[PDB]
Amino acid sequence: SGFRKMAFPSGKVEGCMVQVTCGTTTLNGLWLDDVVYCPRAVICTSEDMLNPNYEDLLIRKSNHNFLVQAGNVQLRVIGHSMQNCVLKLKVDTANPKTPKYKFVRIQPGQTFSVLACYNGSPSGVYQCAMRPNFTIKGSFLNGSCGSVGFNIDYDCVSFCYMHHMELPTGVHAGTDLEGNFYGPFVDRQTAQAAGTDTTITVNVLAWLYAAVINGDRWFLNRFTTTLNDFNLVAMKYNYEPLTQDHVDILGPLSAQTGIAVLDMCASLKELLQNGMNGRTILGSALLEDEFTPFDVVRQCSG
């Protein structure tokens, strides 16, 4: 029993974290086989960062301008190239700790584990969702650039996020591992803002199922609703429209609990209209939307 924001065990990723330094700028890199991946912002000085021309800055660098350190060992860079917003630094040593891995791009609404890192040294692990507006509500300080986000399936690490920057609202933006940003952002220190965000409806419903599996059922009711009628309420409260595919993905949880999805939708409708009246659900006083159906099934009893 119990329900916690749970991250994947970080060990396989810890073995891949290195430090990359160019000039007086340092950040984290990801060392897989004989390549170190890192944000191209590492070739920027403070003055470059307002309006960097990265191809210009890069052509003025040589391999030996890149100091890569893995623990006590300096790695010799033997080649470098830029792919979108990341650098690929070819090194002369293949990482003996390289896990089975994939570079995947995730969808808004999906979750992943973040290994926060500083100077190539892992400092903490926590779970994040990709927000509908392609930001993440992370916990990152200066030096965190290059920390990665990932999921683990069997023994394969699917890397999905490399951290770059913090927006003025305090939220975070980054790229997939081929250096393509999530959302309409660029790696320069300019005024940028995210689109308006929305709440991830299918995830809230998954979390309501988790609560029932865990014995919170005060919010249930005898009512039902149609998909169309629920989506009318969702738009009022800035929730995402619910689709038949979301109803389908919720199938297993609805079968485990005996609560029809549209019945749980009616429960959610009342919560949105009434609030909670001083009660809690799985220890929260608000509707949690950063657990996917998969997260719920993975963690909850069958």
Binding site: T21, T26, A41, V42
Partner: peptide, 10 residues
């Protein structure tokens, strides 16, 4: 306010 690229100082 502006975006902050969160690299560190060597």
């Amino acid at each position: 306010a502006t975006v902050r690229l969160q690299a560190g100082n060597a």
